[PDB]
Design a protein around this ligand. Structure first.
Ligand SMILES: [Mg+2]
Ligand SMILES: [Mg+2]
Ligand SMILES: [Mg+2]
Ligand SMILES: [Mg+2]
Ligand SMILES: [Mg+2]
Ligand SMILES: [Mg+2]
Ligand SMILES: [Mg+2]
Ligand SMILES: [Mg+2]
Ligand SMILES: [Mg+2]
Ligand SMILES: [Mg+2]
Ligand SMILES: [Mg+2]
Ligand SMILES: [Mg+2]
Ligand SMILES: [Mg+2]
Ligand SMILES: [Mg+2]
Ligand SMILES: [Mg+2]
Ligand SMILES: [Mg+2]
Ligand SMILES: [Mg+2]
Ligand SMILES: [Mg+2]
Ligand SMILES: [Mg+2]
Ligand SMILES: [Mg+2]
Ligand SMILES: [Mg+2]
Ligand SMILES: [Mg+2]
Ligand SMILES: [Mg+2]
Ligand SMILES: [Mg+2]
Ligand SMILES: [Mg+2]
Ligand SMILES: [Mg+2]
Ligand SMILES: [Mg+2]
Ligand SMILES: [Mg+2]
Ligand SMILES: [Mg+2]
Ligand SMILES: [Mg+2]
Ligand SMILES: [Mg+2]
Ligand SMILES: [Mg+2]
Ligand SMILES: [Mg+2]
Ligand SMILES: [Mg+2]
Ligand SMILES: [Mg+2]
Ligand SMILES: [Mg+2]
Ligand SMILES: [Mg+2]
Ligand SMILES: [Mg+2]
Ligand SMILES: [Mg+2]
Ligand SMILES: [Mg+2]
Ligand SMILES: [Mg+2]
Ligand SMILES: [Mg+2]
Ligand SMILES: [Mg+2]
Ligand SMILES: [Mg+2]
Ligand SMILES: [Mg+2]
Ligand SMILES: [Mg+2]
Ligand SMILES: [Mg+2]
Ligand SMILES: [Mg+2]
Ligand SMILES: [Mg+2]
Ligand SMILES: [Mg+2]
Ligand SMILES: [Mg+2]
Ligand SMILES: [Mg+2]
Ligand SMILES: [Mg+2]
Ligand SMILES: [Mg+2]
Ligand SMILES: [Mg+2]
Ligand SMILES: [Mg+2]
Ligand SMILES: [Mg+2]
Ligand SMILES: [Mg+2]
Ligand SMILES: [Mg+2]
Ligand SMILES: [Mg+2]
Ligand SMILES: [Mg+2]
Ligand SMILES: [Mg+2]
Ligand SMILES: [Mg+2]
Ligand SMILES: [Mg+2]
Ligand SMILES: [Mg+2]
Ligand SMILES: [Mg+2]
Ligand SMILES: [Mg+2]
Ligand SMILES: [Mg+2]
Ligand SMILES: [Mg+2]
Ligand SMILES: [Mg+2]
Ligand SMILES: [Mg+2]
Ligand SMILES: [Mg+2]
Ligand SMILES: [Mg+2]
Ligand SMILES: [Mg+2]
Ligand SMILES: [Mg+2]
Ligand SMILES: [Mg+2]
Ligand SMILES: [Mg+2]
Ligand SMILES: [Mg+2]
Ligand SMILES: [Mg+2]
Ligand SMILES: [Mg+2]
Ligand SMILES: [Mg+2]
Ligand SMILES: [Mg+2]
Ligand SMILES: [Mg+2]
Ligand SMILES: [Mg+2]
Ligand SMILES: [Mg+2]
Ligand SMILES: [Mg+2]
Lengths: 122, 118, 113, 214, 54
RNA sequence: ACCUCGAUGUCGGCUCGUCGCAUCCUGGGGCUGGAGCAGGUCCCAAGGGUUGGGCUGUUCGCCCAUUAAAGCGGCACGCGAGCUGGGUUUAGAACGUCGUGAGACAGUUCGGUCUCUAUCCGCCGCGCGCGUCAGAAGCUUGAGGAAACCUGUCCCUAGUACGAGAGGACCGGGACGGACGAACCUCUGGUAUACCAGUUGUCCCACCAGGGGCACGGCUGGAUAGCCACGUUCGGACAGGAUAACCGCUGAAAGCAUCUAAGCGGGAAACCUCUUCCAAGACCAGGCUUCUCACCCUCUAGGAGGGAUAAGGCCCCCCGCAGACCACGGGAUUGAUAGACCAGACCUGGAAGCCUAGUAAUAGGUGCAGGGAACUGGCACUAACCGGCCGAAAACUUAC
RNA sequence: AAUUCCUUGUCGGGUAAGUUCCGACCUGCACGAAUGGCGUAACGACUUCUCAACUGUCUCAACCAUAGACUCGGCGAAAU
RNA sequence: GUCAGGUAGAGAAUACUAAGGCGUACGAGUGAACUAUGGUUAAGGAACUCGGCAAAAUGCCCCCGUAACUUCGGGAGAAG
């Protein structure tokens, strides 16, 4: 449940390690982005040697959030930290490897590449 | 029992508690007191649960009532008279009857007493 | 008693073992992967049990690839097919929320005697 | 024709469908109704059926109401309402005396549920009308929950009837529509509706068929 | 705010009219063999001698 | 220079709106230098919608990320007895400039009190009285109003129409959303001032043990009910009528022609039904039906006045998730209305006493223990009473 | 520039976005040497810009208690 | 202006208390809006605003360890 000006730990090896939200995509006047909701972001700090450098405006997708998410079957998935992966405009990650577990909602948002690439899916 | 729904009776939450405890002590000591009608309505269930503690004779129940009441003569008289007196009455140990209104503030008055029939 | 009991007795589940918060369990959840039924096991520590009878829920915590995970289930959910209690924990609470703030060897549970 | 029944709101719980998805349900006792009267255009000016629900002691029935039930031939009930029908061919199948139970509905049937919503007392414009408040800081002076402007200056010089102000809230007829009947417990005279129903527990509701989704 | 005009006698007497009292409803009780009138609220308390019938 | 100088408070922002259409989006079209995609221009259309930030005191404006779109205006450049007070316009100080100076500057900079118990109209809710040709009660019809109306993406159709290629639809179907609104509390989450536990300081209950008062509920960890959103569910429809622009049919005047002159049609989120809610003080004060349908006295017999009643209601009483009071709803012994009591659900988390292990702090057992509010079911034990107050009919005319 | 109207001057930094800010440039409307000029460690309830932390300031508000408001009894004004 | 019990405590601070002194002069009710004064708040964390205004936050003792700069005193309780 991510606002604008919310900071999310980047969860792939693009080089960035923190981002800040700029807008939530998926509708006019939208507020929150749970798991599976693509946002536009600004990179707030990155490893200096990476390709994704600091200040770059990028497109990321949330893969785990601290706020609980109801599932259709009555179950809930809740993480201990907010994380996003930087993807392309082609709906696939820019990095070559995903770190940490990833909430299962990306499979019905057609983020096939990420779900295939994260060590284990929740 | 069920809490006060509106603002607490003595002007605050802590004053209502001590106010109830003093009212219950006086009721058990004298067997009949006259106070205001809301205070009497609040004192009925609170005093009857102490009487229930006194009806069943254990050290644990004596400790609970001493926790709430803080007067050892009244605790003795509870467990020596009132508990045994109500060994065959199942609840409803008290009786509130409405009496004439006060004069200074025209406060609705009432009297609580202990039932002496069975 | 408890008015809607007559509507809720029907769907209550048998074969749910007794388990208290502090217990290490594995819960087998059945999950569809493109209409293909697989079974996925969540092995964690029970950190609460919010009381409701049919609406009874329980929360499990598990530390996975460096990130903590909470999974909350309804106790009588039929996606759960099986709950295994592996060990019994020694706790003094009904809700072990502090485990979300402790990490590692300090997230340990005393073994029940 | 638009079928319907009177009942009470027992409470609400959850069920799991066959595909293992939790469904919130409100449980309604759609207990027996006797029809006590028919309204027809030839006599009353419109087609409707007056039916009675509830259990009441005859000692508690006022003599006019008891007489109106005697003219029907049925024992008095607590509540009496009526269904607006549409034509006479609809009221052809209702006769004064007969019965109707929850088995009028079925699985998947969409129903409109009419109830009377909970009372919210004297409510302010934020609770009542969803007003934006005002600032909690930066200098705001005793206006943290007040409506503010209620018109313009000297033209029109008044406050435009219909202005949203603060007053009694709740306690109103509310129809929630297109609510799925998850399951009718036929033997126990209960029906389980997917969603929420207006009113308190043990309140009278009218469960009618849906016109938008019939 | 402040009253713009002095208010008229009809309008003054219109809501001075609402400031009235209602007489309590009395019932009869028998104390010491002689009849007295008391509110039905105080009926029991008169019947067991806890209200002072002057 | 027409009202206001025995006072009409001055910019911007906030809150809350309201109306126009000179239309920003959505809807309907005509012409194109309109192949399609996408446009240009004009016409019709005001139902709903019309984002969050950076820079600046900002309006204006510049930019950032979006969006179907980020419309323009009137209302004392709407709105300070509704807020603010950054701007502007006192008194302090300083810079630059002018002045001999006191000082001054549509020059700049730092600081700089925003009063009011609502009388009347207006508006949002709530009662009391009378009326609707007897007195009451149940269910209703609706004239007349108010509410609501927004919209995107993906996929089939279809890589099809069209096009050299790039590109790529009309129309019709299917799936999921964004914002908004309403009800609700099963789930999630919040809160919890008479719930449970731990704990520090101090005093007290003679002392030990166990507890209590006070320190923001002392603090801390949880927390059922109720209220609630961050939660759950549902909504905007379908269809019909009359149309706007526009498109016509059959057609004279005017031998051909023309949507018009006689006649007949298609035609949009606008209008009328439709959906939801209020609604007979709707004075044309309505309809269906049930109940009571009676009992005397005086004035002087014409009408009135008084009184006792019925059906019914009101107060008193026990309450409510109904509530500012009032009203509303339920109960009132032929009674489960509230409290107590018993049991259950639930919350806390394993009471006290004893025994035991250890030098001890402490740990184990007895034992899902003890405590406990709201939720459910039993139970007349306690209160709902040896009860008062209101409250029922002229006739006449014609038709029958 | 507490000084520059022109002006949101120009270039760099800083932000996703920089009319303030910092470092410089010199076209000083209209700086300038005891009405001192230029620096300066320490000091400041001074003015300005920034980061971390922290939060109901905000998204977007909900709930609890107390004093009023509200009801009952007593007394009992006011500006106008 | 004088006197200055106890227990924590550096303390005449603060919490609770002793002796002593008060309960100080309208009350009784009541879960309305709204105002005031306190409290808590999921996710986010200055996105508010003229401006982090107001709140939140740090806070004590003992060890370790402390920067540019300096007028050699400091900065310094730096920071950690
Ligand atoms: Mg309460
Ligand atoms: Mg209050
Ligand atoms: Mg008070
Ligand atoms: Mg206290
Ligand atoms: Mg439990
Ligand atoms: Mg607010
Ligand atoms: Mg003020
Ligand atoms: Mg304030
Ligand atoms: Mg004004
Ligand atoms: Mg006017
Ligand atoms: Mg002139
Ligand atoms: Mg004049
Ligand atoms: Mg003037
Ligand atoms: Mg004047
Ligand atoms: Mg004036
Ligand atoms: Mg004047
Ligand atoms: Mg306005
Ligand atoms: Mg036009
Ligand atoms: Mg327009
Ligand atoms: Mg168009
Ligand atoms: Mg065109
Ligand atoms: Mg319309
Ligand atoms: Mg600025
Ligand atoms: Mg406007
Ligand atoms: Mg203005
Ligand atoms: Mg204006
Ligand atoms: Mg103003
Ligand atoms: Mg002002
Ligand atoms: Mg100012
Ligand atoms: Mg000056
Ligand atoms: Mg000079
Ligand atoms: Mg109508
Ligand atoms: Mg609502
Ligand atoms: Mg519940
Ligand atoms: Mg909770
Ligand atoms: Mg307690
Ligand atoms: Mg002792
Ligand atoms: Mg001790
Ligand atoms: Mg203590
Ligand atoms: Mg004391
Ligand atoms: Mg607590
Ligand atoms: Mg808590
Ligand atoms: Mg609640
Ligand atoms: Mg012709
Ligand atoms: Mg022609
Ligand atoms: Mg009218
Ligand atoms: Mg009528
Ligand atoms: Mg009556
Ligand atoms: Mg009643
Ligand atoms: Mg119990
Ligand atoms: Mg124990
Ligand atoms: Mg009960
Ligand atoms: Mg009479
Ligand atoms: Mg007459
Ligand atoms: Mg400057
Ligand atoms: Mg200058
Ligand atoms: Mg400039
Ligand atoms: Mg620049
Ligand atoms: Mg500079
Ligand atoms: Mg000089
Ligand atoms: Mg000079
Ligand atoms: Mg000189
Ligand atoms: Mg100088
Ligand atoms: Mg200088
Ligand atoms: Mg210096
Ligand atoms: Mg100084
Ligand atoms: Mg100062
Ligand atoms: Mg809201
Ligand atoms: Mg008060
Ligand atoms: Mg008074
Ligand atoms: Mg001392
Ligand atoms: Mg002191
Ligand atoms: Mg003393
Ligand atoms: Mg009140
Ligand atoms: Mg507050
Ligand atoms: Mg928060
Ligand atoms: Mg938090
Ligand atoms: Mg910051
Ligand atoms: Mg800002
Ligand atoms: Mg900033
Ligand atoms: Mg802003
Ligand atoms: Mg501050
Ligand atoms: Mg503070
Ligand atoms: Mg150091
Ligand atoms: Mg320094
Ligand atoms: Mg330090």
């Amino acid at each position: 449940m991510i606002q604008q000006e919310s900071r999310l730990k980047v969860a792939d090896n693009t080089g960035a390690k923190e981002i800040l939200c700029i807008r939530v995509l998926g509708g006019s006047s939208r507020r929150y982005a749970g798991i599976g909701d693509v946002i536009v972001a600004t990179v707030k700090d990155a490893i200096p040697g990476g390709n994704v450098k600091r200040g770059d405006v990028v497109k990321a997708v949330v893969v785990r959030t601290v706020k609980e998410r109801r599932r259709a079957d009555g179950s809930y998935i809740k993480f201990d930290e907010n994380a996003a992966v930087i993807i392309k405009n082609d709906n696939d990650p820019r990095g070559t490897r995903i770190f940490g577990p990833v909430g299962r909602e990306l499979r019905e948002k057609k983020f096939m590449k990420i779900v295939s690439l994260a060590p284990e899916v929740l | 029992p069920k809490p006060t729904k509106g603002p607490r009776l003595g002007g605050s939450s802590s004053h209502q508690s001590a106010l109830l405890a003093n009212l219950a002590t006086s009721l058990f000591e004298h067997g009949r007191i006259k106070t205001t009608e809301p205070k009497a309505r609040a004192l009925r269930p609170y005093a009857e649960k102490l009487i229930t503690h006194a009806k069943k004779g254990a050290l644990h129940n004596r400790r609970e009532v001493m926790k709430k009441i803080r007067d050892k003569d009244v605790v003795h008289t509870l467990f020596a008279e009132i508990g045994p007196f109500y060994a065959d009455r199942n609840g409803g140990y008290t009786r509130i009857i409405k009496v004439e209104n006060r004069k200074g503030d025209n406060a609705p008055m009432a009297v609580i007493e202990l039932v002496r029939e069975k | 008693m408890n008015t809607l009991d007559f509507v809720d007795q029907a769907s209550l589940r048998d074969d749910i073992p007794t388990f208290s918060p502090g217990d290490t369990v594995n819960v087998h959840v059945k999950v569809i992967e493109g209409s293909k039924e697989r079974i996925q096991v969540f092995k964690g520590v029970v950190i609460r049990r919010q009381g409701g009878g049919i609406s009874e829920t329980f929360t499990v915590r598990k530390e996975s690839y460096g990130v903590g995970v909470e999974r909350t289930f309804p106790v009588h959910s039929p996606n759960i097919d099986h709950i295994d209690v592996l060990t019994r924990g020694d706790v003094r609470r009904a809700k072990l929320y502090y485990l979300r703030e402790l990490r590692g060897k300090k997230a340990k549970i005393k073994e029940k005697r | 024709a638009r079928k319907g029944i009177l009942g009470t709101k027992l409470g609400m719980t959850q069920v799991f469908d066959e595909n293992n998805k939790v469904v919130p349900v409100t449980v309604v006792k759609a207990g027996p109704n006797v029809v006590t009267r028919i309204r027809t255009t030839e006599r009353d000016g419109y087609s409707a059926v007056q039916l009675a629900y509830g259990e009441i002691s005859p000692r508690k029935v006022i003599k006019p109401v008891a007489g109106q039930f005697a003219a029907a031939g049925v024992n008095p009930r607590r509540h009496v309402a009526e269904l607006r029908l549409d034509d006479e061919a609809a009221v052809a199948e209702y006769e004064v005396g007969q019965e109707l139970t929850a088995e009028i509905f079925s699985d998947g049937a969409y129903v409109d549920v009419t109830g009377t919503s909970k009372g919210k007392g004297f409510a302010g414009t934020m609770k009542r009308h969803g007003f934006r408040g005002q600032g909690a800081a930066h200098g705001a002076q005793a206006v943290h929950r007040r409506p503010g402007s209620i018109g313009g200056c000297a033209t029109p010089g008044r406050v435009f009837k219909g202005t949203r102000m603060s007053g009694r809230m709740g306690n109103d007829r509310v129809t929630t529509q297109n609510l799925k009947v998850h399951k009718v417990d036929a033997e126990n005279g209960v029906l389980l509706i997917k969603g929420a129903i207006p009113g308190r527990n043990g309140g009278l509701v009218v469960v009618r068929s849906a016109i938008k989704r019939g | 705010a402040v009253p713009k005009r002095r208010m008229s006698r009809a309008n003054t007497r219109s809501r001075r009219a609402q400031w009235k009292a209602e007489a309590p409803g009395l019932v009869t009780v028998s104390v010491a063999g002689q009849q007295r009138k008391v509110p039905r609220r105080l009926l029991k308390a008169a019947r067991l001698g806890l209200v002072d019938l002057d």
